[model samples]
Target chain A: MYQPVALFIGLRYMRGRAADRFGRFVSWLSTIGITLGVMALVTVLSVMNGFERELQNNILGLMPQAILSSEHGSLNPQQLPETAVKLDGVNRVAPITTGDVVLQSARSVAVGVMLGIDPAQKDPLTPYLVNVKQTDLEPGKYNVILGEQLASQLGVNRGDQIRVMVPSASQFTPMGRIPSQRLFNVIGTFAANSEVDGYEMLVNIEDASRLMGNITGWRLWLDEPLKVDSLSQQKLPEGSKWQDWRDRKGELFQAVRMEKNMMGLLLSLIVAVAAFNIITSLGLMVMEKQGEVAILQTQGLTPRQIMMVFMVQGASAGIIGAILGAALGALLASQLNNLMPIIGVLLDGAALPVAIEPLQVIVIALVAMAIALLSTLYPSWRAAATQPAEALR
Target chain B: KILLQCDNLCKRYQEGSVQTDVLHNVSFSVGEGEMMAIVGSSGSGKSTLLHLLGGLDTPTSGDVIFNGQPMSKLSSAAKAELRNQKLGFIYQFHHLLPDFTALENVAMPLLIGKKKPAEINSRALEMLKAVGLDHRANHRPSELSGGERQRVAIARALVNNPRLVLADEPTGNLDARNADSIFQLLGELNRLQGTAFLVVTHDLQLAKRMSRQLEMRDGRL
Candidate 1:
């Protein structure tokens, strides 16, 4: 029943200057509605993906993919690093002795988490380091690097001395328990544009060991941090387990992901609402074409063929809108870094991140087209069921 | 031989609780190439009988048999095939698709019949020429005069060489001159192709021109 007859008649009806006054206006508006809605969904979703990438690189940059540790806060120090470094996905391994410390300057005081790193390790911190390099934390130098905000709160600058005390690693004395303390030179400050900038401090691994009295654990950096959750069963001593970055900050990334998905769903509703406009457009068309359909019915076109005629008309609108929207949205998203500024979203020195997935755009268009086609069903059925005698009468 | 048959045909309309019987127990048959006319007033159900014969509407208590097969027993596709291959219908309003050219409108039946494009075009052209509208074949219904539009409709109805043409008030909307010309064209086409014509008309003068006439008074012939 679906033959070139349907295609020929449908296209003639779609493109011609229809006799009715409102048919052309309604079709134009429906097409524009679908295109605009699809464009919004694609453009906004691409931006959200960019934000996710930025957050992962910003926060996850300074953290280790996994760590080999034990319940006792200690591992077979020599055996653990070797075992972790030889693991299949491990890229680098370093001794990490971390502790909560209080820093007192002449002008102020603050609490911070201290991360101890070796200067000989690979430089994975270049992007996150604001004014300092990893080599600033030299062995035995007792030089410490503070987060930019933490340094500001402590009223300390480079080469200035600040007293640090570990409350957890206290010593027993005849009079009272005394906290272990040290005086360290401030090397520089780094920034990550997040909460870490206010609470984290970095120093040398050897000096931090002397301060904490032993190593806490080893940090294992992997080649793919996004797949950090998949690592298991490393050949290590008994009572040892792995703590990946999820332990440090899974909920934060989860919140971002939840936001991205919610935003995507909300934007898709625009496309759905636009698709429903096809119903009204085709409904008006059916009303106007009732007499012509009666003639077709008399001339041997099946009810199904009549239905196919209208379906083709409505579907072509959807395909046209989907194609135009996908192309426009992709082009707009690709140039958003340049376009956003013209629209008054000023970026100080950074480009707005945009990641366009070809597969995602294709899916968006397909779903939109499906919705439009589904909307055509009722109107097409109405056209097919037109009573020839009644209409002609 | 009988080309179409109707038996015990009845049609009713129930608005709410009031049942109006438009046709009650009417039976008729037409022989091959009879070119008969059913003449009546507006409310006498002449158009209703034509619709029943063409399989466009179902009768309340009876059925029509075309080409030796019962219309009501066949599937919808079979009914469509019968309409496409063996019967044709014409309306008073000349209901041509407004967007299509007269040529395309005439070719629609052949296209639905799944004929080759070359065959459809030539056959449609010949039909249009027979109706004296070949020069206006490319004009749409809106561009053509009312008479020309009605002629295109007649060409469309006859393009498939149907065994019977069911025309309901084929000249009802035309002036006297145009009406006479259209009726003459129908008569010529009927005699030339040896096709039966079941024409419903309110004009008594035109009704008397046919070889046999049936007067439908209150749906009974």
Candidate 2:
């Protein structure tokens, strides 16, 4: 790059030798301030991103990205799955039959949600399912997969038989239509590490149809789950009501986004405040260098060049501070998982999930530099306006 | 031939509602290779008149014509360019940049003019050698003695080989011996380089040594 004479002079001044002790201190202080501000912003934002990602992967993992149903009643289990699978961006589709039921094991009883799914089709959504494949859920076998928490609550294990009772299901024989009951063997258990694990169980679709009468609804998975609402809305079947994952968990994610925005705004103020410090420091430098400025002007430095000198001087501190802060922030963010345990925030050996968006980091750096550049205006203008005659006198 | 011409130049300063006429119809010209001195007491506006002649400050009325160009007609940028190329300046306080070494300070004007680094350094060194400060080229202003600092300032002014040098009490801050030596150096440089000088001073002996001299009383010369 072709450098200007003012840049050379400004850099020399920034070095702040013996006579310029105060100026040097003030400059360093401003730089440190910017450094800390940028560091905090990058680190905290990364953590927030981590939290959001974890929620999307774990919570949304079990919940359907989108749900489809007939406006009049339930969907046709035979046709809806095939119809949804062919839609654009649709990754997989599974028929869903869910109902509340009371389960009685040999030692205990618990209330849970019984979800029925096909044994042949694989579900990409669920992360739970230890030692068992989705295809292992054979139809008409009356086998059930209980969540770890639910199994513990009901004192049941794999191969243990349990009785399930549904309030709506009834026998018309005697005693005014008594509730229908069935026995099911626990084939496997899964741990989701969420509240969903406490009340959820899986059974064969055919058995659920026999017990619950019909499919409750159909669940659709898309390539981009976050865009479910828009994508699903465009391809909805006629007279069918639809709900995406947002409808169920919108408030939770919304709160996360809101918190992230508010936190970012608040942290950005630190950078702004530090940038403002550049104004004060540069102003002092200009005042002290008025005599030298007059000399430079007589030597043919134009007013614009003088302004550039101070601008470069002030901006140097900001640039250095921002670069250092970015490097430090990225370093910390990358090692956050390892550092968290040392700080005593344990996540059961699971590292705190962090996603560092390159674009976000770049924006932060640019914003900080912009703020620092703005802070130079007044000081540089004052430097340019210094009169040679008066300053020399 | 006349190198610089001043035509009835006037300068006025205003503070609040009061106006002060600092220079009144001061007209003079310095010829090629000429040494001229202006002697005045404090507050006599000698420096003000020098400032106007050098285009560092604007005259309230009248004009300063150098070579064929009128100072009053030039834009600020043009005036600055004229100063950089044609006129050199020296102050009594030896106003060198505190942060730069003697060589760097001397080379500043050439640097601002965007000269090549090697050429600037060579010319600055040659100028320092002329002033017998070549050995102290690396010393900053603060590290130099009073006399050495003034010598460095002189070298800085002459580094660009300007046609006319404007020195306002260049030796006023030095001791008696140092002042005499500096005055002799100026006269020697003028003879050797054929450079014209317009020096403002309070020393009668120094003024008498110039080929031509003027006295300023109140605001009139």
Candidate 3:
């Protein structure tokens, strides 16, 4: 009952007719400041959150969640198959070998990494692999999968043979250097994206062994990409280093997270500024409502009640603005990708890459609420300590 | 029955580099059920004396005792509690809460002490009826005229049945007929309810009719 009365009084004071135009202007300023603060904070956090999601989905999906590698480029394939089956968090592990090689096509010569994979067992990570097709595996240890750009550059199609050269210096005769080389039929094509397409090619492990000196390793898929690092730490066989995707792409992931933190901090200032406006608003309100406060004090209400009234009012504004902003942020975050064209139009064809997620909404809302509370403190305290006789006059 | 007693009360104010004394050793006392008026001209310190007597401000060099408790010695919260339970103050401007209706304003003294809503509501209704504002119980201060507002302020002051009711120029803003009717109501309530009143007023004619009249000049009684 007391709270409702206080709320009613608080609501009235929030929109009250003051002695002059300046006072009403201050009131409106506070409300507008809070609203804009909430909106900006939510938008920035959502974009940052969206960017992080894109990194995880698009980038992580292409790499093996966990991998067991040997520096000597040699491993017991049978032992790998058995050990992989016993490891926890490992859904499946398939032997793979990758090395740098140069390809010679009719129109262009390009350098790329040759990733030798078993066609029968690559489906677990297929969605992430770029431009891979079913026909790329049928040449029985004599075929290669070419990147879209690489194939386009080389002007090669299916069934066309391309020369693959590996950097090698073998002393066939003393003091003589020669490069190791092989020829492979272009049996398939794949496209991850224009960026990854510049450097990736897939071939059968049997052909890779013959072409690149028999390198062997295992690609282990996990239920979750984030668990790969910890799972690898606990599950790798003796003498084998379990390398998770983080080891291969640690710099990129760290850069993304750091970018998110920096962006979030910068954007939070909007909310902070808005919260400060609340302080200014409430301070002016205290000045205007001094008489009302004194009257209440004389009626047996304490200074604390006066403070509580303003605090409740400020909190009400924060709660409403933050909730609305958070809901909008969540909605925008979920559909940000589809909105890229509209954004591109606004930006004159520059599209910002962002991935929105739930965590961002939670973080932005909390920031908004905290800023609101901080803004309420000074005004609330001033109102609470106002003297009755002097204020009423 | 001694509800309020002020002894050797002194209050001073500093303006620029000049010192002005508002109260100088003003002394007074009020017994339960007695209606006494403190009368003085402008700048005579009657309002200041009333403030000190009500525990709204501290005296520069004296003690204000209410119901045998020293007002200045209590914690701020405790002082407010005492004011809510044992004393009520009516200002010259009425100072009614604009958001609440007359019934709510009248019941505020009881509500502030955390009384149940139903009890406060019923008591507030009865009190408003006593002041002939029962029909206007739901009207806020903005909706009430000057006399109606002052009557509500009085009802609010006495709602909790405080031992002392302090009015600082309660009729200062009223016209003659309204002021007389308000004074009549105050006299009837004093005679019937036996609540003490320490009314500060500049109206000598109204002051002369009180059970007792105390004169204040230059903060001295």
Candidate 4:
């Protein structure tokens, strides 16, 4: 059985005139500290998560989720028509021959990745450049499509002819050898919203095969991009390892995940510091209520009972603060990105961008609760150890 | 029954390597229905003696037995139980929980000892009336006068009907008239309820009023 008298006495003493100011200030500081910790941690993690998602989506939308290349890195444009129809999850499989090349337009020169893809099969996978029509890549004519950034860099548009050059194996000329060069008519332009936009050049698969090497395999496109990993892992034809771009891009994904965890750890330290404030505040309360605690002890309250009293009081502050912080953090994390623009407008300049990730919100909430529990331990212990003789003399 | 017995109790505190003995081999006993006072000057350890008698503090050496049970040998929890069930203490400051009503404060010892609430509440109300605080039973300590507060403290000390009531300067904070009234209330309770009293006080006149009186000079009885 527990005594209401001792509990009432403990609660009253904790909230008495002698300790009210200290208690209130402690409660406020603890609450605000938790709030700020939760808010900042949630916002930063969400934004980082958003960056990772966007980078993968924007980059993968242009690059194949999985790419199948040959020993000589060249593929037959005609061989894909028959194999493409037989592959499961494959919407389109176009022959592609890609290599590094330099483009010279009227006023500018730029280095870019030259992609040679069958015009008819390219549209289903990369729909952004599909609307260029047959005029963009005529069957026999050497015309090319470039990303908008690349087009602007080269100072060229449709109907402009650009000289494309690749390192050639020649030692007889005055220049040791002129690289294999071809003049291409720039036919169309599109943007993929990343570094690819500044360094990608597109041409016909036939031109690519002639310039690069001989036939190999087809560039396969899946109907559902997410299924590429599992489908690639399944049984496939011999002499090929159905490799996805993710396999090649493992380091990039690892870097992104590491960044997220590092940010979380840093933010969790902020929460830890805030939780320390809770410990300090409640510690002060125990010290201030020593006299009252002695009175309760003489009045017949056991040390265990005193322990529970302090526990209830300290945990009440933690729970209330944690709940408020969780709600505020969730709300802020969800809206941080949208708030950045408004903040920029208010500041009369482009401010920092914010992104929201669901994982960040969950981690911040859990961290706040852990801090709350950690903050109550010392103060409660001190309250229980009080001696009744403290009130005498 | 002899409600309390203290034989050659001693308590010492260390201050900067100096040993200050508060209670030095004090011996006393309180039988049921007895009203006794331990009168002494400042720093004479009257309150310290009361602390030992009530089991709130342990004797450095020597024994305190309440109702034939050794106080020092019991565990801390058992001492607390003994204090809650067989003894009660009233302080110079009344020591009423300021947030609770007079009845709730009076009922505190019983509740702390885990008595049923309704029964404690009824008994607490009865004790309040016995101490002439029936009408003021619902008032908090802040709203009561010094005499009323002391009366409430008296009711609290008697609420559980403990065999021994230890009042440490029960009237020390009150005016002479109020002090007299409080002493009268203690006297009446000692007479009517047969509750033993070992009141510690500097007021010689108040001590003289009790049935038996002992003086503590430098912690010596």
Instruction: Pick the DockQ winner.
Output: 2
Which is better, 1 or 3, measured by lDDT?
A: 1
Instruction: State the RMSD for candidate 3.
Output: 5.3
Name the docking class for model 3. Answer: medium
Q: lDDT tens digits, residues A44-159, model 1?
A: 67776776666557655656565656686544466544643456676666777666787755677788877777777754643567767766566666788777777665666777
True lDDT of residue B76, candidate 3? 78
Each model's TM-score, in the order given?
0.76, 0.81, 0.77, 0.74
Q: Residue B39 error for model 4, in Å?
A: 5.4
Q: Each predicted complex: what DockQ?
A: 0.59, 0.60, 0.49, 0.47
Docking class of 2: medium
Per-residue lDDT tens digits of candidate 3, residues B1-221?
67766778767655235677656778776778775777788878666666667677775677877666786678777777887887778776547778666777777777778767789899999888876889998776886787678777777777777667777777667667766666666677676777767777676756456557767778665
TM-score, first chain, each model: 0.76, 0.80, 0.73, 0.71
lDDT of 4 at A140: 75
TM-score of chain A of 2: 0.80
Of candidate 4 chain A, the 10-residue stretch with the lowest lDDT total is: A344-353
lDDT-better candidate, 2 vs 4 = 2
Residues A1-393, candidate 3, lDDT per residue (tens digit)? 356454766666655465566777875656666666666665665555545655656555656565566766467665545644576766666667656777654667788876676667655565544545654575455777776766765677766778887674222445665665667777667776443345767766675334334446766667776644455447445657744355555345565578777777764577776777667766776665567776766555666676677777887767765676655555665564566555444653213555555555667677777767667887777666677656554
Clashing pairs in 2: none
State the lDDT of candidate 4 residue by residue for A147-183, as single tens digits: 7776665566666777877653212366554566677
DockQ of 4: 0.47
Tell me the whole-model lDDT of each prediction, alpha carbons only.
Answer: 0.71, 0.72, 0.67, 0.65
Residue A43 in candidate 3 has what lDDT?
68
